[PDB]
Amino acid sequence: MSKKVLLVDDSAVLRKIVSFNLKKEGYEVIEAENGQIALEKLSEFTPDLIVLDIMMPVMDGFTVLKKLQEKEEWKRIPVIVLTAKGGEEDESLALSLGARKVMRKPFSPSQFIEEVKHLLNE
Amino acid sequence: MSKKVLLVDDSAVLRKIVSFNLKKEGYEVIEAENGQIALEKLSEFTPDLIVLDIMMPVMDGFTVLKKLQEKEEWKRIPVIVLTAKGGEEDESLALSLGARKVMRKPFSPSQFIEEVKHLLNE
Amino acid sequence: KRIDRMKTEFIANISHELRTPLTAIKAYAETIYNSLGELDLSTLKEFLEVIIDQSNHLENLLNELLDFSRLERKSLQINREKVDLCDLVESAVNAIKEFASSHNVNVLFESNVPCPVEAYIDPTRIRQVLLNLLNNGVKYSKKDAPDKYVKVILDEKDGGVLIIVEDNGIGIPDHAKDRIFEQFYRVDSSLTYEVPGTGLGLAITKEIVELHGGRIWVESEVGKGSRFFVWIPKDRA
Amino acid sequence: KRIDRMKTEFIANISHELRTPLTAIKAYAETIYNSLGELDLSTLKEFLEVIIDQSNHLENLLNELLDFSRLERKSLQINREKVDLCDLVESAVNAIKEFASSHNVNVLFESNVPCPVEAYIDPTRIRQVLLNLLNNGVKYSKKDAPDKYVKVILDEKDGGVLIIVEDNGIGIPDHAKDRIFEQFYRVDSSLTYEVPGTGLGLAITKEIVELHGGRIWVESEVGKGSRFFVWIPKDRA
Numbered sequence: 051m052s053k054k055v056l057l058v059d060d061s062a063v064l065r066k067i068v069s070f071n072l073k074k075e076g077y078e079v080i081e082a083e084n085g086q087i088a089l090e091k092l093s094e095f096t097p098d099l100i101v102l103d104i105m106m107p108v109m110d111g112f113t114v115l116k117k118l119q120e121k122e123e124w125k126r127i128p129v130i131v132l133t134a135k136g137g138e139e140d141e142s143l144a145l146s147l148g149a150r151k152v153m154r155k156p157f158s159p160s161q162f163i164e165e166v167k168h169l170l171n172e
Numbered sequence: 173m174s175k176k177v178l179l180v181d182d183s184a185v186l187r188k189i190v191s192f193n194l195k196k197e198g199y200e201v202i203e204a205e206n207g208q209i210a211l212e213k214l215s216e217f218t219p220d221l222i223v224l225d226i227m228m229p230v231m232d233g234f235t236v237l238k239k240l241q242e243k244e245e246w247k248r249i250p251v252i253v254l255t256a257k258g259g260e261e262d263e264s265l266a267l268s269l270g271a272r273k274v275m276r277k278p279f280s281p282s283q284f285i286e287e288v289k290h291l292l293n294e
Numbered sequence: 295k296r297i298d299r300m301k302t303e304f305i306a307n308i309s310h311e312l313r314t315p316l317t318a319i320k321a322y323a324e325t326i327y328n329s330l331g332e333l334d335l336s337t338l339k340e341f342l343e344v345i346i347d348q349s350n351h352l353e354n355l356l357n358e359l360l361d362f363s364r365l366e367r368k369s370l371q372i373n374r375e376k377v378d379l380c381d382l383v384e385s386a387v388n389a390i391k392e393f394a395s396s397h398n399v400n401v402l403f404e405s406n407v408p409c410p411v412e413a414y415i416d417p418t419r420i421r422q423v424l425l426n427l428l429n430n431g432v433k434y435s436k437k438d439a440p441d442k443y444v445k446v447i448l449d450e451k452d453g454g455v456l457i458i459v460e461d462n463g464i465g466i467p468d469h470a471k472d473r474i475f476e477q478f479y480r481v482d483s484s485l486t487y488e489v490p491g492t493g494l495g496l497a498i499t500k501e502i503v504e505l506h507g508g509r510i511w512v513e514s515e516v517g518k519g520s521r522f523f524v525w526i527p528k529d530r531a
Numbered sequence: 532k533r534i535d536r537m538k539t540e541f542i543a544n545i546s547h548e549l550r551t552p553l554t555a556i557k558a559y560a561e562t563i564y565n566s567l568g569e570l571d572l573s574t575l576k577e578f579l580e581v582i583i584d585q586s587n588h589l590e591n592l593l594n595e596l597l598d599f600s601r602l603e604r605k606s607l608q609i610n611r612e613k614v615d616l617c618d619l620v621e622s623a624v625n626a627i628k629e630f631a632s633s634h635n636v637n638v639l640f641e642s643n644v645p646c647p648v649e650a651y652i653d654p655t656r657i658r659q660v661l662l663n664l665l666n667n668g669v670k671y672s673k674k675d676a677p678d679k680y681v682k683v684i685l686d687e688k689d690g691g692v693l694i695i696v697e698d699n700g701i702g703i704p705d706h707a708k709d710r711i712f713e714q715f716y717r718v719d720s721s722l723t724y725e726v727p728g729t730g731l732g733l734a735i736t737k738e739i740v741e742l743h744g745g746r747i748w749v750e751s752e753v754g755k756g757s758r759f760f761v762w763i764p765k766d767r768a
């Protein structure tokens with residue numbers, strides 16, 4: 051049904067499966083193959099939740115989170131980071147870089163959704 | 173066709189999936205958790221094909237192999253070896269030690285059968 | 295010097311230990327895919343969950359490689375909390391009952407101390423260490439016994455807590471019984487060559503322990519079994 | 532031997548590179564498992580082959596660790612036969628067009644000698660050597676360009692075949708030019724901190740070639756791309 055989600059990942063295989071789980075709960079989703087695309091797609095509308103991963107080619111997840119947290123409309127839109135980097139420093143570099151939740155990869159889709167639910171229902 | 177298969181593997185999980193694939197074809201299977209068991213399940217009857225792996229606790233499958241090629245009745249019962257040791261001298265060692273065929277793990281169940289078939293219609 | 299000959303074997307071991315579950319995963323997936331007609335709901339879910347379980351093993355193994363780096367890069371944390379060491383053992387004992395049973399291993403937790411035990415340590419990281427030895431306790435045992443178990447004895451000693459992990463499996467030749475703690479070290483044996491291992495487990499364990507300002511040592515003989523003592527100051531000085 | 536700082540980061544790379552496919556496997560499997568209601572046959576089978584394809588990625592990465600060990604042990608052999616090199620490279624080209632497209636890469640096989648080309652080498656290990664440079668060609672390329680290809684050029688030279696692997700991609704600095712063929716080496720730049728890379732591909736390739744009594748070497752500057760030359764004598768000695 052209602053809530054939108056911007057899903058940003060240089061991975062197609064991963065976008066598919068994250069998307070499948072999202073729409074299974076009603077949400078609609080807009081993909082973003084990278085950081086540039088992510089923001090280009092963003093000047094157009096405002097997602098109610100964002101799913102961002104870190105390592106990608108044109109512009110990375112770190113810079114993306116940055117531009118988010120330095121702008122008034124964007125500051126407030128919650129972000130779940132999905133990264134393969136577990137190193138608990140990376141997590142702080144992410145929360146301090148704006149993120150509202152960090153989730154390690156590999157991840158449980160059910161948990162992930164369980165997280166995506168709470169963040170849409172604060 | 174109505175042929176028996178003796179399945180030698182210390183892997184419960186792997187026995188279950190080989191067995192499934194085997195029965196999908198008709199063949200019946202007698203399981204064996206190690207080398208010792210493998211033989212005290214062999215004084216009982218003669219199988220039309222044996223499926224054997226290399227690493228296991230009580231007695232390894234290199235010995236088991238040795239023993240099949242030093243009996244008259246057993247000499248002719250074709251063995252497929254399934255090992256995680258794909259090093260192409262581990263294969264020589266296996267063939268010389270008696271085995272008619274060696275299959276590297278991970279293996280494709282379909283090929284495995286395709287091979288198992290080929291030896292059953294010898 | 296030698297470290298380069300050992301890492302060359304530590305490689306062949308990441309290889310071997312990771313392809314066991316990968317073999318389960320690839321076989322079950324392919325079978326499901328190839329047998330959706332011959333597959334009854336019950337069986338599909340069973341095979342699906344095998345795949346899931348096997349990845350969780352594979353994930354843990356990968357976690358070790360991650361932990362390790364973060365250690366041999368002296369770049370690892372520790373976040374202390376009020377933990378009831380009594381439960382932190384069983385909450386971690388039951389987590390083993392599966393692996394245990396499939397090896398014919400009974401698992402026991404005893405105490406010589408009152409059992410609302412308090413401790414200011416890292417619950418997640420101690421858990422992991424606990425698991426390292428419980429695991430080796432199972433992973434390493436007498437290959438045919440009804441008698442066999444892995445016992446955790448929890449105890450307070452020297453104003454610190456002393457956890458000990460006893461096994462009636464095998465032990466270690468003395469020529470290595472403290473060589474077993476360094477990263478990449480495994481015990482080669484004709485009795486124990488089929489076991490999957492990295493040789494990081496215990497080195498991860500040591501580091502975690504030594505960072506809690508504690509220590510770990512071993513006492514074993516070639517048939518009775520083994521004991522791992524982990525000394526931990528109940529609250530840091 | 533700084534080989535001990537390098538293998539330390541090679542440890543974290545094995546980590547990162549294996550958990551990408553493992554992340555697909557777990558996510559897809561748990562999904563199938565939890566969404567049989569909301570899957571149609573066509574998606575089911577699709578998700579199942581995702582699991583299967585990611586497994587095979589993971590199998591190849593494990594094969595790399597294996598090969599390497601068999602090399603750093605001086606313990607691996609070649610089994611040469613009469614191969615039509617022209618097919619072997621194309622069989623190889625065909626074997627990449629997936630990866631190729633996933634990165635918007637065109638794949639080219641050019642011939643400068645006539646194409647029934649005969650050879651006395653091991654098709655398996657050479658196919659492997661091909662796939663190694665091909666891959667790296669795709670894997671290392673212009674992050675945004677329409678022009679991009681990977682070009683395999685066959686040739687005979689000095690009574691011996693000369694295969695070249697040209698890319699129009701991202702290219703390599705001079706200081707690194709000689710050290711790209713070692714165990715564990717990876718060209719670190721803010722440009723490509725993203726690539727899964729083991730750091731073993733070329734080490735395995737050099738070794739495999741230098742056992743056919745041939746050589747591998749490189750030309751490149753940081754803008755145009757890169758050339759890989761594998762000189763291999765018609766029949767060795």
Ligand SMILES: Nc1ncnc2c1ncn2[C@@H]1O[C@H](COP(=O)(O)OP(=O)(O)O)[C@@H](O)[C@H]1O
Nearest residue numbers: 430431434474479480481491492493494495496
């Ligand atoms: N409870 C035990 N009994 C016998 N041997 C053990 C025990 N625990 C550890 N070891 C020895 O210590 C070595 C390395 O320890 P660890 O790093 O935990 O093992 P691995 O990574 O191989 O599981 C093993 O190869 C094994 O020989």
Ligand SMILES: Nc1ncnc2c1ncn2[C@@H]1O[C@H](COP(=O)(O)OP(=O)(O)O)[C@@H](O)[C@H]1O
Nearest residue numbers: 667668671702716717718728729730731732733
């Ligand atoms: N075609 C190429 N273009 C640019 N750089 C390359 C190329 N091939 C190899 N390299 C460099 O060599 C390093 C490692 O070589 P190799 O072992 O083949 O790669 P990998 O990291 O995929 O294992 C990489 O980090 C990369 O910078």
